Subunit: 209 residues, 3 copies
């Protein structure tokens, strides 16, 4: 397979370099805009330069290993014009991927994640450690599902949605584009665009836009 | 082994047909009373007819793949007189079944479920995806444990109990017959018969009967 | 390897005898101070005597299979003077141990636990069933992490901390020595020494000392 460039050398990039190694991929290096990270390494993998160096690595697959949905969308739209680059899809060997699962490119399915049946993910999604997506779940593009999230049957998550760690979503709930569910939330009602909800049961905290 | 008939062609039946395939079982088909589902399929497995056709398949094992505890009890008592039918016990290959685990027939233990030591389940139980039953847990008949439920040591769940997704039950709690714990609940007190409790900490919402 | 002595023949000792068997270890027996447990067994493994018999088994590895952090510290300081005894480190075969994970002796990592990258544990820790410790997590000595706990990146847990079942800790939170997080808590703020916090979001309940 192509060597991999990981965009983002933070905590998620750290864990995605681990995922890539477990997937048998050779990581060429990271791109990252942080001044303090130039000339640094994670486990023998160098930070190669800033994101505008991506054009020097068109021979590589990319992945955008940054948790923020809006960060991944911003980076793809600025640095990765349609058709110019290829993206990896990384699925941990300990993830369970069942039947009629469709995953678009750039997606990361991490250790212990479970996608059962009839699940559809858009591009550049994250399903983090030990999260569960049950029957009929649909994710748009740039969705982040944090560790231990519990997403019941027939849930729909719009584009640039973030589901926080160990949150629980009732079956048949819809979450509109850009919303965010706080860690630990218990979501029993539909969520509107750009809403942040928190708590048990989840209630509106604020709007992100 | 015998071919399997799955009663219920809904979301749970979808996931239990997946479980059966992962268990190496041949699924003859589903029985389901929904008019709109007659002549339909899930992943090449047909809906054969309504539940009163069960008598045409006594050569098959059955499983009642319906989440509602009371639905499974109703169906067994009406359609499955004692001794006339055999029931499968389906344990996902990725479930962990430890030592001195006793599971009665009709039970479904799904992907990533963990039953550690000295756990006892009655007939027609569900332990859904990634749920954990720790030391000394006892379940009656027709218990449903939803995905990611966290059932601590020495918990007793009566007949026709339902524990919702990603709920947490304190060690040594007893839950009487027919009760239901909402998704995400934090249960730190005993629960009486037919009570619905929700929240953190769990409190009485209403009675189911 | 050396035969193992398990200190504590309660619920945790039950599950740790299971862990030891899954790890290929021969358990010589338990030590336990309970009068009613003298002459008893768990799955063919005898309670050998009280903790003051430890000096008769210096040929064995020990593990202190008691959930209470303060119980493990008390027992080590009274019965196990520095250098006189050796301690096992038990890691379930179904635990995922990633890269740059450092675990000190006496630690138990149970079934389905996940430690991703750059995680450090002190002595006599417990990571119970299906718990997740993400990038950069640090635990002191005698930390207990209960089943299904969700500990996000860069969390620091002091000595003798207990994190209850299915609790969730926000990234970069620090928990000072001796604190306890109730089961199911949603921890979004730093915790001070000896504080007990509960709820969603977690709030101070009381002080343990
Ligand atoms: Na699309
Ligand atoms: Na798991
Ligand atoms: Na779309
Ligand atoms: Na019984
Ligand atoms: Na009974
Ligand atoms: Na959980
Ligand atoms: Na230390
Ligand atoms: Na120290």
């Amino acid at each position: 397979m192509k060597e991999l460039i990981i965009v983002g050398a933070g905590g998620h990039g750290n864990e995605i370099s681990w995922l890539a190694k477990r997937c048998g991929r050779v990581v060429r290096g990271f791109l990252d805009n942080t001044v303090e990270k130039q000339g640094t390494f994670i486990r023998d993998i160098p930070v190669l330069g800033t994101l505008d160096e991506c054009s020097k690595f068109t021979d590589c697959d990319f992945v955008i290993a940054i948790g923020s949905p809006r960060a991944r969308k911003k980076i793809i739209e600025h640095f990765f014009p349609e058709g110019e680059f290829t993206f990896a899809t990384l699925i941990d060997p300990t993830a369970t991927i069942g039947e009629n699962i469709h995953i678009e490119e750039g997606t990361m399915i991490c250790a212990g994640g479970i996608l059962t049946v009839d699940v559809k993910l858009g591009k550049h999604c994250i399903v983090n450690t030990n999260a569960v997506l049950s029957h009929g779940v649909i994710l748009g593009d740039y969705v982040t599902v944090a560790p231990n999230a519990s997403i019941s049957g027939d849930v729909s998550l719009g584009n640039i949605v973030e589901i926080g760690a160990n949150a629980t979503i009732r079956e048949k709930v819809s979450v509109q584009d850009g919303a965010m569910v706080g860690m630990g939330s218990v979501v029993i009602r539909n969520i509107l665009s750009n809403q942040v909800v928190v708590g048990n049961p989840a209630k509106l905290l604020k709007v992100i836009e």
